[PDB]
Design a protein around this ligand. Structure first.
Ligand SMILES: *[C@@H]1O[C@H](CO)[C@@H](O[C@@H]2O[C@H](CO)[C@@H](O[C@@H]3O[C@H](CO[C@H]4O[C@H](CO)[C@@H](O)[C@H](O[C@H]5O[C@H](CO)[C@@H](O)[C@H](O)[C@@H]5O[C@H]5O[C@H](CO)[C@@H](O)[C@H](O)[C@@H]5O)[C@@H]4O)[C@@H](O)[C@H](O[C@H]4O[C@H](CO)[C@@H](O)[C@H](O)[C@@H]4O[C@H]4O[C@H](CO)[C@@H](O)[C@H](O)[C@@H]4O)[C@@H]3O)[C@H](O)[C@H]2NC(C)=O)[C@H](O)[C@H]1NC(C)=O
Ligand code: YQ9
Ligand code: CA
Ligand code: CA
Ligand code: CL
Ligand code: NA
Ligand code: NA
Ligand code: ZN
Length: 806
């Protein structure tokens, strides 16, 4: 109930909410069916429009007008945004040359530069260049402020997940808004676009910027606006809030445009009907900046112009129907569109089987435009698994396509020409970032980054301490003139042991054999030095990774590679080696095909054994440092140590072998040497975080050899490729992957063909940030470089995406 009999007189766009049954006058009352009877009349005036005309100047104040051109309007804080231009001979903000804002220039009483978050729905990254002629205001912000060529949204590239990620710095899986539509089995409730359930606080996890601000004593404008409140009125409301007395006035504001998303859906990303919405958004920005200039705030306020995702061409004729694949199409519930999520229609159906559903959707048609996954098998970079609202079965839909259950659903529920939601690496889904103000840099271009990073920065801009989030704080310092956050390296938790030769060959009973009994103080002093780490400055370029958790492990040195060998997991946590441009690929000699050698520095009890692999009919093994890249026939013996060995399904050995024999060399050629760090990842609960040993669900049969869910590699070289990887004087260049360790290659529909037609495509799909590997291993890389820590944090958040140019 709401007793809508109260009045909004003096309460228009009040900042604190009132609880029913008192009627409301805040910018969300419409949405709650709760405004006072007189809201429209007092708060939503329209009389005479939004602009001063020549014959309104000096007018007698008339309260019925949407905005005023009267002489007392500046003091009352309610002039039309163009007042000074029409009536006081002023120029528009867009006509003024930009001049660096070296320090905030604010009125007395302003404790901090305010922040205005101007968010635009569906604003595709390429609009910055392609629409540039019709967006003079936005282009001024862009070229005079700090901008990125594009910003990477989170997956799914939908509205609520992205807007709430902007607000919290969290992945949807952590914030809980995992789509525009959800079922929560624990609540037994559904979240929809239309309806009252989405208003319930229980959907919304983490801590959005407005709450963070409020708790730390920074006052926040109410972020949201009911759809019917026109853009011009939202702008005038923010500007009014900005005239409030010091003690009442918020420091952080939000504006949201439904455009250009709304039109994009109807007309496609580049439909000729798209020019007008872009003009209109530019006009709104024009008004904001003109209104800031009026109040002397245009060199005080930090402005963020930010989109949530792009927009792609998508028509009804590009729809895949699950009814062309499943016989049982009525036993399932599908969340449809640009992603698919499937669950059983009924919990009381024990004949429902996800395994047979996936198989029925796997590589069934030649140009099939989606790919089924169990959620834990999705590329780790999407971070889309660790929430009970995300269904076990997911469909990654090709760009430009939809997935639906039955044809009836499409024609009884073509209209649309645009949609979004696809993989967050897709170019058409990329969106925009611009920061403009005293705290942002002047005329600075920064590299693409992910929207999860912004929460931290907005906290920095307001002097706030961010709640724990998925950003890497300091990784965006290069956007800021001041307010940078100076992080320190996490402290190493476990120090390594440096074992010497401690065991005799005969103490080992591992069922391994090697034809290594083929036998000089010249070459014996040499190999001693190698085992003590003589070549370590070659193979370990950035220092050893720090172990950030309590464990027991050994550093092992070799001519060609160095490892951190875990006595707990019986394999290295990491293996580091450098391949120079000149390096030579060689084969495993015939006599050594099945060679595994005990490591006389590591006890039998902390070693794997060959018997368990023999007995395990499903599981074979591979090596972290590849035998193919051994620097000499004698050095090759090192690569067969039981301590370089890791469990691999024969299916995955196909991927691994090709990576080690063909791809490392190719990258070394193209990048002028590469440093490689490779290792296992255990993420059995798919939380993105290193599993503890009691979380492992699979061992090589008969043993305590744990089976990785994934294998990673981090591939570093010199950004200036005229310098060899091992002699780099400046910034680095990185790409990484986290390959799922699967018993089949069902993921790649081409896998019965030669590795050269599918392996690299799969690796690219599973591209990763070094930071993703950090979370998954509890390791901290790049500890010893000559680079600043902020620059290294940026490097660690880099994602190599393999999309062409935007
Ligand atoms: C990205 O960033 C985020 C944010 O930093 C990272 O997420 C954090 O990771 C931590 C480790 O997983 C986790 O810490 C746990 O907290 C548990 C209680 O937490 C509550 O309070 C916090 C703080 O206010 C709150 O944020 C939480 O909110 C979650 O849940 C609510 C309600 O369901 C949601 O609305 C909200 O969206 C959020 O959901 C997400 O997180 C939860 C995990 O908490 C997931 O289950 C969801 O799917 C969703 O993704 C909570 O309200 C606490 O119970 C844990 O403590 C257990 O384990 C520790 C080990 O140290 C041990 O000391 C304790 O004994 C305890 O064990 C007991 O419970 C076990 C399991 O039930 C049981 O086996 C035992 O026998 C014991 O009984 C733990 O400390 C932290 O909550 C989240 N925070 C967020 C916001 O998600 C995330 O990891 C980052 N991602 C990457 C890739 O880096
Ligand atoms: O009011 C906020 C808000 C505005 N700003 C916000 O945050 C700004 C900030 F991130 F900067 F903080 C947030 C936060 C998510 C809560 C919400 N809104 C109002 C609209 C839009 C965001 C939501 C999504 N809706 C839709 O109808 C919709 C829109 C486009 C679509 N394309 N395809 N399907 C679509 C469905 C309903 C809601
Ligand atoms: Ca959107
Ligand atoms: Ca885990
Ligand atoms: Cl969704
Ligand atoms: Na085997
Ligand atoms: Na296959
Ligand atoms: Zn949309």
């Amino acid at each position: 109930w709401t007793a809508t009999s109260g009045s909004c007189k003096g309460r228009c766009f009040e900042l604190q909410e009132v609880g029913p049954p008192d009627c409301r006058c805040d910018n969300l009352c419409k949405s709650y069916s709760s405004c006072c009877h007189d809201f429209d009349e007092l708060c939503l005036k329209t009389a005479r429009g939004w602009e001063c005309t020549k014959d309104r100047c000096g007018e007698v104040r008339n309260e019925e007008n949407a905005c005023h051109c009267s002489e007392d309007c500046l003091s009352r804080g309610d002039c039309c945004t163009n007042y000074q231009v029409v009536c006081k001979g002023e120029s528009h903000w867009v006509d003024d040359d930009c001049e660096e804002i070296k320090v905030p220039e604010c009125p007395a009483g302003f404790v901090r530069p305010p922040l205005i978050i101007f968010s635009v729905d569906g604003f595709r990254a390429s609009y910055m260049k392609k629409g540039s002629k019709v967006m003079p205001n936005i282009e001024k912000l862009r070229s005079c402020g700090t901008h990125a060529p594009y910003m990477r949204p989170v997956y799914p590239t939908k509205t609520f997940p992205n807007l709430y990620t902007l607000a919290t710095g969290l992945y949807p899986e952590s914030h809980g808004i995992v789509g525009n539509s959800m079922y929560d089995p624990v609540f037994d409730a559904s979240f929809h676009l239309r309806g009252r359930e989405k208003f319930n606080h229980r959907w919304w996890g983490g801590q959005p910027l407005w709450i963070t601000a409020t708790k730390q004593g920074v006052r926040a404008g109410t972020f949201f606006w009911s759809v019917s409140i026109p853009h011009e009125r939202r702008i005038l409301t923010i500007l009014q809030w900005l005239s409030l007395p010091d003690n009442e006035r918020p420091s952080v504001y939000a504006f949201y445009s439904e455009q250009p998303d709304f039109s994009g859906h109807k007309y496609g990303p580049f439909g000729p009907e798209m020019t007008n919405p872009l003009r209109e958004i530019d006009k709104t920005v024009g008004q904001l900046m003109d209104g800031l200039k009026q109040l002397r705030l245009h060199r005080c306020v930090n402005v963020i112009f930010v989109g949530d995702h792009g927009m792609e061409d998508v028509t009804c004729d590009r729809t895949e129907f699950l009814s062309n694949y499943l016989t049982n199409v009525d036993d399932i519930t599908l969340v449809p569109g640009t992603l698919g999520r499937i669950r059983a229609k009924s919990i009381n159906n024990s004949k429902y089987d996800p395994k047979t559903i996936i198989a029925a959707l796997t590589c069934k048609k030649p140009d099939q435009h989606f790919k089924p996954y169990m959620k834990q098998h999705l590329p780790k970079r999407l971070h889309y698994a660790n929430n009970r609202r995300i269904e076990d079965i997911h469909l990654l839909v090709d760009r430009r396509w939809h997935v639906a259950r039955k044809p009836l659903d499409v024609y009884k529920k073509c209209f649309f020409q645009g949609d979004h939601g696809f993989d967050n690496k897709v170019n058409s889904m990329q969106t925009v970032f611009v920061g403009y103000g005293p705290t942002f840099k002047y005329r600075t271009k920064v590299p693409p980054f992910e929207n999860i990073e912004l929460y931290n920065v907005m906290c920095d801009l307001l002097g706030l301490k961010p709640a724990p989030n998925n950003g890497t704080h300091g990784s965006l310092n290069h956007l800021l003139r001041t307010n940078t956050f100076r992080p320190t390296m996490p402290d190493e938790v476990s120090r390594p042991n440096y074992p010497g030769i401690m065991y005799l060959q005969s103490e080992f009973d591992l069922g391994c054999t090697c034809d290594d009994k083929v036998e000089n103080k010249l070459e014996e002093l040499n190999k001693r030095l190698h085992t003590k780490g003589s070549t370590k400055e070659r193979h370990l370029l950035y220092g050893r990774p720090a172990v950030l958790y309590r464990t027991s492990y050994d550093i092992l040195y070799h001519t060609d590679f160095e490892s951190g060998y875990s006595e707990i997991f019986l394999m290295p946590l990491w293996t580091s080696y450098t391949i120079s441009k000149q390096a030579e690929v060689s084969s495993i000699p015939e006599h050594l095909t099945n060679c595994v050698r005990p490591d006389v520095r590591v006890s039998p009890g902390f070693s794997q054994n060959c018997l368990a692999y023999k007995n395990d009919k499903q599981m074979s093994y591979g090596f972290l440092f590849p035998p193919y890249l051994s620097s000499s026939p004698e050095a090759k013996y090192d690569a067969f140590l039981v301590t370089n060995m890791v469990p691999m399904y024969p299916a995955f050995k196909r991927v691994w072998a090709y990576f080690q024999r063909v791809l490392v060399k190719k990258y070394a050629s193209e990048r002028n040497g590469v440093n490689v760090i490779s290792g296992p990842i255990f993420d059995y609960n798919y939380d993105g975080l290193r599993d503890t040993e009691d979380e492992i669900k699979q061992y090589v049969e008969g043993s305590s050899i744990p089976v990785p869910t994934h294998y990673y590699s981090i591939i570093t070289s010199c950004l200036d490729f005229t310098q060899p990887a091992d002699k780099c004087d400046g910034p680095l260049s990185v790409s990484s992957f986290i390959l799922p360790h699967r018993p089949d290659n069902d993921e790649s529909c081409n896998s019965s063909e030669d590795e050269s037609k599918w392996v690299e495509e799969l690796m690219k799909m599973h591209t990763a940030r070094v930071r993703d590997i950090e979370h998954l291993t509890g390791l901290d890389f790049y500890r010893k470089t000559s680079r600043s820590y902020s620059e290294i944090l940026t490097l660690k958040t880099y994602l190599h995406t393999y999309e062409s140019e935007i």
